[PDB]
């Protein structure tokens, strides 16, 4: 709590006979996007997406643009290599996904680093939390692991994940402190929707919260209900906050027996919500 992260997400998607692969790079501080590159957008530059990063100079934008474009070229070569390892044709569209970054404490101290790679939406290879070894998902990925071990890839990446990554994350938190060093606890309420004369949906709501992590749980007489609960994915409002809900179908007249429990880092107590007619 009061922890922070910097994360970059990359997606390369091949489109044989329709051009070079689509490449999309996104950077986030905590749950706030600050940069993007999209091969299909107008500029072919890394571009600002938060007002505090705009104050960076032309040399910052030049270097990020060159660096992001080299990530793109590597992924494009990898799309060819992995197609060979998995023995797939030149005609289908394939996907490489990559995420890496670092976490720090509320005092700016390194907590951890991570990098994970996927191929066609499944684990390919990951850097382990010790930042000195890899885990491959299958025997194709172990060929990559051998190359990366021989080339000492983890040692160069580690110096970025616990040095460069952390110091820039500390800079961005400072440059953006008015916006990024905030916690918005969820504004919660409960709604009630009959589905018949004899049953109704209780929906437990959390709105306006930041950062995005939250837990919503239904209990009946204090016994868990996780298998009869509908949960939706935590969704963005578009103003920098998030929303979520969880619902349970109940017998009309037994509403007061159910409770909804809300856990967010910005909440003094865990909240307990209950539908009471009287």
């Amino acid at each position: 709590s009061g922890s922070h992260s910097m994360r970059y997400f990359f997606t390369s998607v091949s489109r044989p006979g329709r051009g070079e692969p689509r490449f999309i790079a996104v950077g986030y501080v905590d749950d706030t996007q600050f940069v993007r590159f999209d091969s299909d957008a107008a500029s072919q530059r890394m571009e600002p997406r938060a007002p505090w990063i705009e104050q960076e100079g032309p040399e910052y934008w030049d270097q990020e643009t060159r660096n992001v474009k080299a990530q793109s070229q590597t992924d494009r070569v990898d799309l060819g290599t992995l197609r060979g390892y998995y023995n797939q044709s030149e005609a289908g569209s394939h996907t490489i996904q990559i995420m890496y970054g670092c976490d720090v404490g509320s005092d700016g101290r390194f907590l951890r680093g991570y990098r994970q790679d996927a191929y066609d939406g499944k684990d390919y290879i990951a850097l382990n939390e010790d930042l000195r070894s890899w885990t491959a998902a299958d025997m194709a990925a172990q060929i990559t692991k051998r190359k990366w071990e021989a080339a000492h890839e983890a040692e160069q990446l580690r110096a970025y994940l616990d040095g460069t990554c952390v110091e820039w994350l500390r800079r961005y938190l400072e440059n953006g402190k008015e916006t990024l060093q905030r916690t918005d606890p969820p504004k919660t309420h409960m709604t009630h929707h009959p589905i018949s004369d004899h049953e109704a949906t209780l929906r437990c709501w959390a709105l306006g919260f930041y950062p995005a992590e939250i837990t919503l749980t239904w209990q009946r007489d204090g016994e868990d209900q996780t298998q009869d609960t509908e949960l939706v994915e935590t969704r963005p409002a578009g103003d920098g906050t998030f929303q979520k809900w969880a619902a349970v179908v109940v017998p009309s007249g037994e509403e007061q027996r159910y409770t909804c429990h809300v856990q967010h880092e910005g909440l003094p107590k865990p909240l307990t919500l209950r539908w009471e007619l009287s």
Partner: peptide, 9 residues
């Protein structure tokens, strides 16, 4: 800022 690119898979 983004990391240097790893070598090929």
């Amino acid at each position: 800022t983004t990391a240097p690119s790893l070598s090929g898979k």
